Symmetry: D2
Amino acid sequence: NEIPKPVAPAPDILRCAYAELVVTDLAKSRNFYVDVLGLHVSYEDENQIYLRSFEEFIHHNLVLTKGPVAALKAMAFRVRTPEDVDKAEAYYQELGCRTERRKDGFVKGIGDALRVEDPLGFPYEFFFETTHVERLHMRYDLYSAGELVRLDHFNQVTPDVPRGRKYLEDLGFRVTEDIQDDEGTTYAAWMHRKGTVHDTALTGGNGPRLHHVAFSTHEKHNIIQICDKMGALRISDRIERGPGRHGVSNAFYLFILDPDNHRIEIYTQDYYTGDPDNPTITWNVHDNQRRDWWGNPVVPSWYTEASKVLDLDGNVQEIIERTDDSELEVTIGADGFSFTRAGDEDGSYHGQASKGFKLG
Amino acid sequence: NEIPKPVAPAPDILRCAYAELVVTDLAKSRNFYVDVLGLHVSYEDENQIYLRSFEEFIHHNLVLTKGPVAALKAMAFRVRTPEDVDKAEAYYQELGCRTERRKDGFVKGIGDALRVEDPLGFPYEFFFETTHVERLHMRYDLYSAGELVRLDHFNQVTPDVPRGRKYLEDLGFRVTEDIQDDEGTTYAAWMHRKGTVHDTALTGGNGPRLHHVAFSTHEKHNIIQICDKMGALRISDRIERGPGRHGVSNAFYLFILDPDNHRIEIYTQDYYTGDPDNPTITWNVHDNQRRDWWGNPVVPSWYTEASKVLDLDGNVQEIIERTDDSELEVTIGADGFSFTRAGDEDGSYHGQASKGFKLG
Amino acid sequence: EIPKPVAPAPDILRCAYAELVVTDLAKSRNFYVDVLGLHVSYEDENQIYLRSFEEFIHHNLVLTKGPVAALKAMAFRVRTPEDVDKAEAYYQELGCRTERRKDGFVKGIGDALRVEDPLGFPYEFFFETTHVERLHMRYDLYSAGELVRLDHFNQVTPDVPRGRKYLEDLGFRVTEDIQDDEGTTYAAWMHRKGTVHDTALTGGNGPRLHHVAFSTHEKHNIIQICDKMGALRISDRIERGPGRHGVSNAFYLFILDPDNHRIEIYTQDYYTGDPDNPTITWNVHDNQRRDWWGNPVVPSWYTEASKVLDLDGNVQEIIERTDDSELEVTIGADGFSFTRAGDEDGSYHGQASKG
Amino acid sequence: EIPKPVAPAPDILRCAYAELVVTDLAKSRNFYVDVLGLHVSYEDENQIYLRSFEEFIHHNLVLTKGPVAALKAMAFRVRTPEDVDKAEAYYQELGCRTERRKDGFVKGIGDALRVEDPLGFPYEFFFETTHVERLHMRYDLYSAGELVRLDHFNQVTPDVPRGRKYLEDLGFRVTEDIQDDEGTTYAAWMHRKGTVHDTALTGGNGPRLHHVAFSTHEKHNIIQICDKMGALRISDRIERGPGRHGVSNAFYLFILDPDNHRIEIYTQDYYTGDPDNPTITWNVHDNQRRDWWGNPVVPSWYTEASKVLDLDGNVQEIIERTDDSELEVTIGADGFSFTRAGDEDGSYHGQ
Ligand SMILES: O=[N+]([O-])c1ccc(O)c(O)c1
Ligand SMILES: [Ca+2]
Ligand SMILES: [Cl-]
Ligand SMILES: [Cl-]
Ligand SMILES: [Cl-]
Ligand SMILES: [Fe+2]
Ligand SMILES: [Fe+2]
Ligand SMILES: [Fe+2]
Ligand SMILES: [Fe+2]
């Protein structure tokens, strides 16, 4: 059931800007995002913590909101002009989606804002107005050995990747890389507005669920330091996967888990995608260098676990099961297959993960 | 069973200096060590390749010798004076070990040298005299993104760790770190002469076998590049384990496999141990941060596979089975267990490896 | 003052390549390929086409053999084929000389417009380019000093506000500038692609080309370039740096090619893509504005820059700056700079910082 | 010349700590703790004891409040308790003033000998020291500019060959030096622990302490110290660097504390533990010998250094160097340097 291209013009989206995550214990979440990861507090009270990255000048990149059920409440994109908020509302209304408009914002430090239940069930926000804060980009007196410098992207789990992809393309996102097989299945797509590999991404699976939110560092040693610090804090069990080099995106990466199991990616040194004919890279799902370039196996939780998302009433969205083939199953499952070199039996894996492991 | 302390004085050992590895295909081995890893050729012909690291001034750190059976032929330590070669001879003769002395060396670029079949079955060489070569430490016109800068250590597999450790202490090696359990079994020990965490190390297992030879890089990004390069060359299947941060030694590391399955470790940034009361560190075998500080699982091959070693006639040394408990079995096997925090079931793993894998 | 055309500006994506005239193609090849590691897309006896590690367009740099070393063309890529028509109509309304070739001026570029712009610089605008193998994951080739992207140009021009207004009308947004308390502007940086700049204006006699800048992934890659140059015993071709910039916050290095074209190596500036991106103005006497660590700026950096050509290949006449000189006001005989505004301690009178 | 004693030399392991007199303890604390990130081992209203990230002995630096900023002692650890007795007999034979404190001079050091050595420097030798928590895996504490080890001292002394021979007799091995064709020695670097140096001699008016050096893991940690100093608007306290040294091949930075004591931050020199380690001699006119990239050495780096104290805490009188001056022969009015030997292109004359 293809999502039609509206007649109404798409809003001009600049970039991913922030996520609002509902968390169950505000103090525990603060310990993770401020004490462990070093994000900078823009505002806080007994109910919410507003955080930003080192180089950010808008009010925040992450809002932690206390609530009964941990979930993504909104993933927010900044648009180019005030008028683009109106455009977003018209566009989503033409799509038959539920929308909510608040002239003075949903969260502090954001002004006129539109939230929508998008066609894939995700809570998106579009805004232009935001309170500017001290840009900390040269505050080396504050700089952490693991400093998170920008918000980079979101990654969403959705059962039908082509359907979602076409809709995001009409919205103005361009696909930079994807993962497909030779039987017409798409397992994942990455798409951008700001000229990096992505602002959001679609990962095939039961959904809507939020896979992760990604922050960047300046250098690879910064990511190493986050791992090292987690070991010193004896929370290495909260390192889910990595560190590694991605095939898709070519970024150096790490995946960690917050106190409510919300997955955070730390990411650095992908490439420029701003030209409109940027070459789209398609990896085969059985290429064992596509997710980790070094061939390290992808732990099953990375495929199966992701966060709930909320509707505009704050209720959890029903999960719709994926019927397309599962990346987990076709790569590391019982009938799975992966290769190191296409066409070479040597360095290939049948019914198990790479590097001597099987599914727990 | 115990190896007695000789009345004869131990030779004053400076450091690990080089290994001679037998390889089956000299050209394939050359491609690995020179073209992939960037080691510097000090001499080569149809029978051997002599290689050194970027900062070395002695003739070589690695001799690849063509032969029918891939194996370690000699682990060589440089001694402080010519007279220390005589001391090595008298010492091992007193221990009842087979020795062979060549005034003009066993390999090119080494002078007066003593080889011995040591009490643990290993072929050790002791030498002072060596041909000095151009020290390439400032040849940044040659420096590669993955540059190997020193030889750091060897790691030996032997069935009875305390037996070997006592013997090495009498030779002057001082233990820096080890792995034990609460019931008094020793699994591994690291010991040094040169003021780093180790020059050699004992890993409990069937032996004698050579577990690995280790080279150092300047920085962590150099190790990352070796991984990246191996992905680009589509030989990621030869990255065995890593990259990571060690618990033991605190070094950043990587384990890769040469064309004959000889394991090479790349290592950086361990600490100073030269003071005589250098604090020893003992880790519990069930501590999942002891080998990889970030908790990443140790692939079973790392525990089970190691290179054959030769006797002085060039024949393979018979293997003696370990009877003490197996590290693999007590940690990642079906009956093993490991913990993130001592005493905490959260972040513990029972009958499987960390992060969600079981053994393949 | 340069008027704003009625005609719509072209939609400019980014700086894309420079064409440099060099006098000895072999010596230039040694510097750019052997020393700096750039990748050859094409070469013959007259020209070398080079690209950075992550590029997919044909080239980021063209070395063209010629009698007088100079900038021949600074090229920006535009969003669509129709934007090259928009560029042509725009520069015509501006009264500028233009030349358009449906098959390009250099190999690997198709339909292209070159202009002598209102400040005397040879701009090219194009969309069509021959795609080549993007080397971004070719870690088998990766150098310890690898140049990964083309980042920006920097232009010397006598009247900065005049130039700034023209580039703003063309769609560039000022991210950072350098001014004083007496109304003088000494420099401005401006962008299309969401980094600190795609081009920049440095106040001085002009038109001249100050430098062309390439990126590395990390700081250590820039350190390696310096280390390599020492090993090759060509450290005399390191002009300034390495350092941390104040303006841009990037880690940097300035080196000189065999014809004294200045190349900057640059890494890790910040995102400027939001339209209300806060502008940062530095005082010209702030000794942390160019080098954040207070290291002195050698006079050659201010005084030396490359000639630029018109569309016929002749050198552009240099027009003298009459506004105050950043050299003179900070490190000349009557210069001044401070470490902390209003503190005599750490200030410099009539001399450069650090002794 | 300084005669070799018949008494055996103490077996010196390494440079271990310096005691610096500072005039304003709180300002000094800001610098070494807040700016540089050193770790407190003990403090009171008169002294701050500080250590690096990987240290297990009590401290690498003692800041002592006093009227005149100076080096009070540069301390070397010896291998055994008996080596303190050896040091005492050795310096007594040399005719030096010595002072033995069986319970140490500063907290966390036990039996210790301080001497006014033959070059006028206050050396300490000790074995016993209170072990503290070794912070080497305390990544929860690790700074982006983390100082990981004490690496070396550098001493200004007028006659380098005289001092060199005295240090060699004590067991130090020279690794690198700077000379000219006329036979003058301008500087020498010498070690016990298997790095390029534990101490070094810079030709000049002395005794003065040129600097104390700490190590970082990587080059980016040094860059961060500079960046942090910029952010704190104290970039005027960056003296020289960052750079790559020629001698030592280390990546380096020189900064100045509140009393103008010079601190070097240093990383990635090479192994020198073999007894036949090849010695490297640079020509004083080679513009890549100090900074490999050919950046100029600011004259203050040659002319400024810290006072040193005698055992009564009074400042040691200075002896003027009579041998040729490295500043004068390279950057002075009749000085010169080269990039490539024999090439006027890339050479500097009177600048
Ligand atoms: O080359 N020099 O200027 C040097 C080399 C090493 C040092 O530790 C130093 O203080 C100076
Ligand atoms: Ca298929
Ligand atoms: Cl992935
Ligand atoms: Cl290990
Ligand atoms: Cl600048
Ligand atoms: Fe991601
Ligand atoms: Fe090892
Ligand atoms: Fe620039
Ligand atoms: Fe030094």
